[PDB]
Amino acid sequence: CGSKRAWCKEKKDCCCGYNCVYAWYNQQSSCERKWKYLFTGEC
Numbered sequence: 001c002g003s004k005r006a007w008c009k010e011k012k013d014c015c016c017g018y019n020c021v022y023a024w025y026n027q028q029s030s031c032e033r034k035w036k037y038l039f040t041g042e043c
Contacts, residue, residue: 001043002031016043 001015002008007028008020014031019038022029035041 002029004031004033006031012043014043018043 001013001018002020003015003018006015006018008014008018008031009029011020014020017033017035018031019034020029021032
């Protein structure tokens with residue numbers, strides 16, 4: 001799974017406690033933290 005700073009496959013592909021962000025500016029998606037700041041959660 002992609003952890004903070006790490007390519008992910010989809011929204012659930014980021015390591016637990018990390019979300020997936022699409023980086024169109026550089027393609028690929030980089031995972032980034034966010035727990036309370038995200039709906040429900042649980043990866």
